[PDB]
Design a protein around this ligand. Structure first.
Ligand SMILES: NC(=O)c1ccc[n+]([C@@H]2O[C@H](COP(=O)([O-])OP(=O)(O)OC[C@H]3O[C@@H](n4cnc5c(N)ncnc54)[C@H](OP(=O)(O)O)[C@@H]3O)[C@@H](O)[C@H]2O)c1
Ligand SMILES: NC(=O)c1ccc[n+]([C@@H]2O[C@H](COP(=O)([O-])OP(=O)(O)OC[C@H]3O[C@@H](n4cnc5c(N)ncnc54)[C@H](OP(=O)(O)O)[C@@H]3O)[C@@H](O)[C@H]2O)c1
Lengths: 334, 334
């Protein structure tokens, strides 16, 4: 008698418990991701879905889900969902902005600093015993990295996470440039940031941070010609999506010294293995953990629940991504 | 006819070249550190020394250096120099403050973030191919770390580097507490920082950063009872000196979950190997590279040269650490 939601992953219990008050809830509890054929089977009679970036919510899913009215992504990105087709069908799509902004902006800085200061390579040198075995405490030319103070940070995608990365950069006294679809004077005045065309941001920055969604417009925007514009001392950080960067071109740039290093949280396929990329000591790698804090987790689970419960009550969900759907079908289950 | 300086390491050429205009210069150029017996031989007829933290400038060095009038440490720390004995003897001692503040404060944040967000462990997971081999792109419970935003940072040693770490923490919207020998209202008002007794800082902080010199008073100040006061979710960062922390107690704290993790740039002996410490995935380790930026390097070399040249000219050196020596012997060579 309650509407039915399938949750494709073991998200925090707080969100599951909130949903159990208002829905019949099914939760995929396994460590492994749900196989595609099982996803298609399980959506047969669901009114709602909570999905991860690992599930491709495309036309084929919709065709196999005739009761589905709302998809809540447990993520701020939604490049895994065919939102135009959802809108067509009157299906509401929600995401999780804001509650993971600080985690991801912190992780961008974690990657920036780790890459700039040789933290991963340094740790291996110590931890392996090589430092002790070689017998040399310190040398003035070892492990030299790059300053941030007074340097220019270039933020590609000046949204929630991009602005939060700029806020952190102000603590390092950085000159802040950004490229975005829009220009925002509030954030400009609060942070001292300045808009420039993309190729100017790439030419003038000491650190380039990617914080855009994946769309047709941002696919491979960091390509071979764009990388050639960057400084040979510059560090690239990708916390956005893997396919914003042409990895083949990035490998060439790193090997040939077109840029100095890269910190990457996201990859063209996940999981990822690339022997050539992974052989480089001027890259730092993390497995798509930008939003991985206990608190962001929990807050994302609450927010997915709030969206689905608002929808049940005939309210517009607070983090609806496809507002055009409202005029197509009003909220609620039938 | 020019005074003679021995430089114990291959510091940047800019500083060497400045000194060659005014001194007969000898530079130890080898990768390895100068052996103790060679140090004692080489100081026999020097008027000045430029030393690294690796050289122990103690009474025995002074007794073997009868012309020595000034020691310029290529470091801000000077726990490797017996400054009281230098003063006694009329020997000026200088260091390198300021020019390495931003490098070291950046590295403190590099270690804080790497430890809080599992950057080293994450990189090994990806780079080794384990992420790919296990076949799972992402899991909501994997690699969960700690937020900074709104959290409390406790700075032990509120000097040049400690205040610069607080400046960076303001970009993360942190509540800033500090313990120091003094209280500083300027920095309090600029950064919103508040003084507290040491044990209160340890109890109330989510991140504890050590930025004190090594002195009799700070030796093993982070001991077993102090570690027990910390939060089980708290992260410790040591960019100060290894002997500020009782490593045996720190290992117990990390294994027993008294604190959540530690980022360490400095060790009780350097180089260092500790199999038990190095087996822990909740530690991040770097080989005393806090000041290792190209620019800090260069600026340290210039500053050592400026000190020795000012002294030659009968001027008080700009970063003299033992001001009492001035009344003992005026500056210059004879
Ligand atoms: N690595 C991780 O763990 C992780 C975690 C969270 C998010 N992410 C990813 O980061 C992305 C951004 O997150 P967010 O919350 O900051 O989203 P957001 O607030 O929508 O910000 C994205 C910004 O990118 C701008 N943008 C979009 N298309 C662009 C284009 N073609 N050219 C230039 N700028 C463009 C957007 O412009 P407009 O102002 O015109 O909107 C917006 O300012 C998500 O979409 C996601 O892919 C990754
Ligand atoms: N890891 C690295 O690569 C690296 C690089 C640079 C420096 N260091 C180390 O970091 C240390 C600090 O550097 P810095 O330039 O910030 O020096 P600093 O300006 O002298 O600051 C040190 C601060 O520690 C405070 N302090 C000293 N003794 C204390 C005590 N017993 N209790 C509480 N606070 C005490 C000092 O108090 P007062 O205000 O009363 O002076 C001062 O505020 C150096 O001495 C060095 O050991 C490490």
């Amino acid at each position: 008698m309650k509407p039915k939601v399938f949750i494709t992953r073991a998200i925090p219990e707080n969100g599951i418990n909130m949903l159990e008050e208002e829905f019949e809830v099914e939760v995929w509890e396994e460590e492994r991701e749900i196989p595609r054929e099982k996803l298609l089977e399980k959506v047969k009679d669901v009114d709602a879905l909570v999905t991860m970036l690992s599930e491709r919510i495309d036309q084929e899913v919709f065709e196999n889900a005739p009761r589905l009215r709302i998809v809540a992504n447990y993520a701020v990105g939604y490049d895994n969902i065919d939102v135009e087709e959802a809108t067509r069908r009157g299906i509401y799509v929600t995401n999780t902005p804001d509650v993971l902004t600080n985690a991801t902006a912190d992780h961008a800085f974690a990657l920036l600093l780790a890459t700039a200061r040789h933290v991963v390579k340094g740790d291996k040198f110590v931890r392996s015993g090589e430092w002790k075995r070689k017998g040399i405490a310190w040398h003035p030319k070892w492990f030299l990295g790059y300053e941030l103070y007074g340097k220019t940070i270039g933020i590609v995608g000046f949204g929630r996470i991009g602005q939060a990365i700029a806020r952190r950069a102000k603590g390092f006294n950085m000159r802040i440039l950004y490229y975005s679809r829009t220009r925002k004077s509030q954030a400009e005045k609060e942070l001292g940031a300045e808009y420039r065309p993309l190729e100017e941001v790439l030419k003038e920055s000491d650190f380039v941070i990617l914080a855009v969604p994946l769309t047709k417009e941002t696919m491979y925007m960091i390509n071979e010609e764009r990388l050639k514009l960057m400084k040979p001392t510059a560090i690239l950080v990708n916390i956005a999506r893997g396919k914003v960067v042409d990895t083949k071109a990035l490998i060439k740039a790193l090997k040939e010294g077109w840029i100095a290093g890269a910190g990457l949280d996201v990859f063209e396929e996940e999981p990822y293995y690339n022997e050539e990329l992974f052989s480089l000591d001027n890259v730092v790698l993390t497995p798509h953990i930008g939003s991985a804090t206990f608190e962001a987790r929990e807050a994302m689970a609450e927010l997915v629940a709030r969206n689905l419960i608002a929808f049940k009550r005939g309210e517009i969900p607070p983090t609806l991504v496809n507002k055009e759907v409202i005029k197509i079908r009003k909220p609620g289950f039938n």
